[PDB]
Symmetry: C3
Subunit: 97 residues, 3 copies
């Protein structure tokens, strides 16, 4: 029935939106955590550079190529903020369905 | 075509479910890795506080405000556990 | 319900857009996290050097060593196959 199918479509939309919201929220929590941890790590490394000051710093002291952090904070937060906008609007829309 | 639309709804449901499960598994893997890394980092920091014991610890020695780790593990694990339950219970 | 076909393809399109945003973000998180783990293990090699005669960092602390749990390969493959499906779609 057409009205039956309308309700199934609305119901599918409602439940997929809820699952996408759970993922957006979790991805944004991971970004916040990971960025905060990167600040802890680079502060730890500033401490190591001071302890190794005589030897030219941590990476020189170890005689190794210096590893560096790859920061995607801006891109993830922009992407997830636009996703939140879409999901929140779709969520209020389907409260009527 | 009403019958075909019904199969269409079910087909879309199946396909989205498989993609949501892929993201759920990867989010959960990322959370396990990130949480394990935070314990490594904090252990490294305890070692640095030992090395800077006479200067009052790492952050005093550097004359900086201490950076703070923001932990969301419980919230991420609960969000994803509930999402796995909904995905599984609707699987028909 | 007369435009159900348009509603269904619309839903498919919207969800595809949202899954693509989540895939890109998960994959960026994976690259950042893996890079941070390399910085952190290099930091710990420095600490093990400073504590060499004590037997390294975790012995000097009198603690069991914490270790990094790596899922890079699994995440990358999962997200590669997802991108493969989403672009086909
Ligand atoms: Cl560290």
């Amino acid at each position: 029935s057409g009205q039956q199918l309308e309700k199934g479509l609305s119901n599918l939309h409602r439940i997929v939106t809820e699952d996408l919201q759970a993922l957006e929220k979790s991805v944004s929590n991971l970004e916040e955590s990971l960025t905060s941890l990167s600040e802890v790590v680079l502060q730890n490394r500033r401490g190591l550079d001071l302890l190794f000051l005589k030897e030219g710093g941590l990476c020189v002291a170890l005689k190794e190529e210096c590893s560096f952090y790859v920061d995607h904070s801006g891109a993830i937060r922009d992407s997830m903020s636009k996703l939140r906008e879409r999901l929140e609007k779709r969520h209020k829309e389907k409260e009527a369905g």
